[PDB]
């Protein structure tokens, strides 16, 4: 399986660098084809580039490519596996459980949707506190997705001033800061350095364990007041899954694994949604024509009176296109999360041995030159036909694809749709640095893009 010849100890780092590694992968694909080999120091990585290879692996050999693969830093920073990093029956069975409970009406009288709607009108209330004055939305937008997960795991959101909530928030955001430092790919190239610089990974381990404790005291309060035959949140359903398993007791569901699945949901369920929303508003500032068009659909379909809901989305194609086009443009997980093969397998006639790490290039699919003609340009017509109707694409994979597809695809769709429409129904976004100037080009470091810093005022309508 071809690829550039790597140097003695520094792997392929001269060829890919430490900057925008997804761009380097596209360039390498131009010379080695859609299936190349790449060395992260001494570790052999198969990269899959265009749609055809990604679809052929993740969908057609779905089981064979179902494995999760772990780079050095994550290996050291993770004590205990839940869902994101699990493999085999542990992953198969917890993931299955989690999707069950993440369905709209999958645990109690309260739906996921009602959770997201409650959050939407609190999000709006807090933005109303900003008194139409310049503000960095990073924090407020960060709280809403975290709080949806709080409500899903604990039945009950927290006021945004609740100190339980701010600690969990502080702990989650610090993990995102540590993890966005450019010299994180330096660890994956030279893992020896983890020992010589353990600051990173010790801070991750300390933060996770803080969160694990907090959750533990939560599942205790649950074990106490828990009504079987009447589960109301994630913890309840897990606790009672433990009872239906307490007999045949090898057993994948335990207090350890619930803590682990819980921290994952918080980590996987906060950062990406938060950034997508922050980036959405940035783009809505830059392109006010687009914003004006979304507001016409809101006044027409939903009033100014009631609150949005999911049934409204089928009747709002432009807004569905904007949401779709934010996710595709911004390409927040350029190489999703590293995959790994389940056994020795010939792929496009190449032979790839069991447990070999795979990087899926989601960028190559999301920014396919042909499906999306100006792919590095923000344009909702990418998902509209000549009438105003919504136009699906099989190249829309920001949640990846196949057997490891984001467990929260639906939830994220609800959050994005309901928080964005809720914000634009209630406010007009005013820029302070004038649309024309401000730059919306992703700041990329390794496998993580983020918008540049901006401010805006939320002026009520
Ligand atoms: C449930 C809360 C939750 C929310 C909200 C959420 N995710 Fe996820 N996402 C997950 C979990 C859990 C996984 C792990 C799946 C697995 O390993 O089997 C995941 C995995 C992924 C992967 C894994 C890639 C792969 O092939 O293995 C990508 C890409 C991803 N998410 C993107 C997103 C994007 C983009 C958003 C929103 C803009 C988002 N997720 C919002 C829970 C969430």
Q: How far is CA 15 from CA 31, 42, 446, in A?
A: 12, 15, 14
Pairing of strands 443-444, 427-431: unpaired
Sign of CA dihedral 338, 342, 345, 348: negative
CA 47 to centroid of ligand 1, rounded, Å: 20
Residue ID of nearest Cα to ligand 1 atom 3: 269
In the chain, count of helices (H) and strands (E)?
A: 17, 9
Strand, coil or helix: what is 67?
strand
The pick from 69, 337, 408 for probing ligand 1's pocket by mutation, whose C-beta has the most ligand atoms within 8 angstroms, reads: 408
Rg over CA atoms, the chain: 22
Q: Which residues are annotated as a binding site?
A: 406
Q: Contact, 41 vs 12, CB < 8 A?
A: no
Report the candidate in 375, 138, 402 with the shortest Cα–Cα distance to residue 273: 138
Element (H, E) at 90: helix 88-102
Q: Contact, 380 vs 396, CB < 8 A?
A: no
Dihedrals φ, ψ of 444, to 5°? -110, 135
Burial 65-93 (b: 16+ CB within 10 A, else e): bbbbbbbbbbebbbeebbbbbbbeebbeb
Question: CB-based contacts of 5: which residues, under 8 Å, 6+ apart?
Answer: none
d(C-alpha 259, C-alpha 256), whole Å = 5
Query: CA 344: distance to chain centroid?
Result: 30
d(C-alpha 63, C-alpha 78), whole Å = 25
Q: Which atom of ligand 1 is nearest to the CA of 270?
A: 5
* CATH numbers and ranges of domains, the chain: 1-461 (1.10.630.10)
**Secondary structure letter of residue 7 according to DSSP:** B
Report the candidate in 215, 210, 212, 188 with the shortest Cα–Cα distance to residue 200: 188
Q: Which atom of ligand 1 is nearest to the CA of 276?
A: 38
Q: Which atom of ligand 1 is nearest to the CA of 402?
A: 26
**Secondary structure letter of residue 58 according to DSSP:** I
Q: Contact, 112 vs 153, CB < 8 A?
A: no
Assigned token pair, 312: 């409204």
Residues with CB under 6 A from ligand 1: 68, 83-84, 95, 145, 264-265, 268-269, 272-273, 276, 332-333, 336-337, 398-400, 404, 406-408, 411-412
CA 121 to centroid of ligand 1, rounded, Å: 25
Dihedrals φ, ψ of 102, to 5°? -90, -5
Q: How far is CA 187 from CA 25, 48, 193, in A?
A: 19, 23, 6
Q: Which residues are annotated as a binding site for heme?
A: 406
Question: CB-based contacts of 451: which residues, under 8 Å, 6+ apart?
Answer: 275, 278, 279, 282, 330, 440, 442, 443
């Amino acid at each position: 399986p071809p690829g550039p010849t790597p140097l003695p100890v520094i792997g392929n780092i001269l060829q890919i660098g430490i900057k925008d590694i997804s761009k380097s992968l596209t360039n390498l694909s131009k010379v080695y084809g859609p299936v190349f080999t790449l060395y992260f120091g001494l570790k052999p990585i198969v990269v899959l580039h265009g749609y055809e290879a990604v679809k052929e692996a993740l969908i057609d050999l779905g089981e064979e490519f179902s494995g999760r693969g772990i780079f050095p830093l994550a290996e050291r920073a993770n004590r205990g596996f839940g869902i994101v990093f699990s493999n085999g029956k542990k992953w198969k069975e917890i993931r299955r459980f989690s999707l069950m409970t993440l369905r709209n009406f999958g645990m109690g009288k309260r739906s996921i949707e009602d959770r997201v709607q409650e959050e939407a009108r609190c999000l709006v209330e807090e933005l109303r506190k900003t008194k139409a004055s310049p503000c960095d939305p990073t924090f407020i937008l960060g709280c809403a997705p975290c709080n949806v997960i709080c409500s899903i795991i604990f039945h009950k959101r927290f006021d945004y001033k609740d100190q339980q909530f701010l600690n969990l928030m502080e702990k989650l955001n610090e993990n995102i800061e540590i993890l966005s430092s450019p010299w994180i790919q330096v660890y994956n190239n030279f893992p020896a350095l983890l020992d010589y610089f353990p600051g990173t990974h010790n801070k991750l381990l300390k933060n996770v364990a803080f969160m694990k404790s907090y959750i533990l005291e939560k599942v205790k309060e649950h074990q106490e007041s828990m009504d079987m035959n009447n589960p109301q949140d994630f913890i309840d359903c897990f606790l009672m899954k433990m009872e239906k398993e307490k007999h045949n007791q090898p057993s994948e569901f335990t207090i350890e694994s619930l803590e682990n699945t819980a921290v994952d949901l918080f980590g996987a369920g906060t950062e990406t949604t938060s950034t997508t929303l922050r980036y959405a508003l940035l783009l809505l500032l830059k392109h006010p024509e687009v914003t004006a068009k979304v507001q016409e659909e809101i006044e027409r379909v939903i009033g100014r009176n009631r609150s949005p809901c999911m049934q409204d989305r089928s009747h709002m194609p432009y807004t569905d296109a904007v949401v779709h086009e934010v996710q595709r443009y911004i390409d927040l997980l350029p190489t999703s999360l590293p995959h790994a093969v389940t056994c020795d397998i010939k792929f496009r006639n190449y032979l790839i041995p069991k447990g070999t790490t795979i990087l899926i290039s989601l960028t190559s699919v999301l920014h396919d030159n042909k499906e999306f003609p100006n792919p590095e340009m923000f344009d909702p017509h990418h998902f509209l036909d000549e009438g105003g109707n919504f136009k699906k694409s099989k190249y829309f994979m920001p949640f990846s694809a196949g057997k490891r597809i984001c467990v929260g695809e639906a939830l994220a769709g609800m959050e994005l749709f309901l928080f964005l429409t809720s914000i634009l129904q209630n406010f007009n976004l005013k820029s302070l640095v004038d649309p024309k100037n401000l730059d919306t080009t992703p700041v990329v470091n390794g496998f993580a893009s983020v918008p540049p810093f901006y401010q805006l005022c939320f002026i009520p309508v």
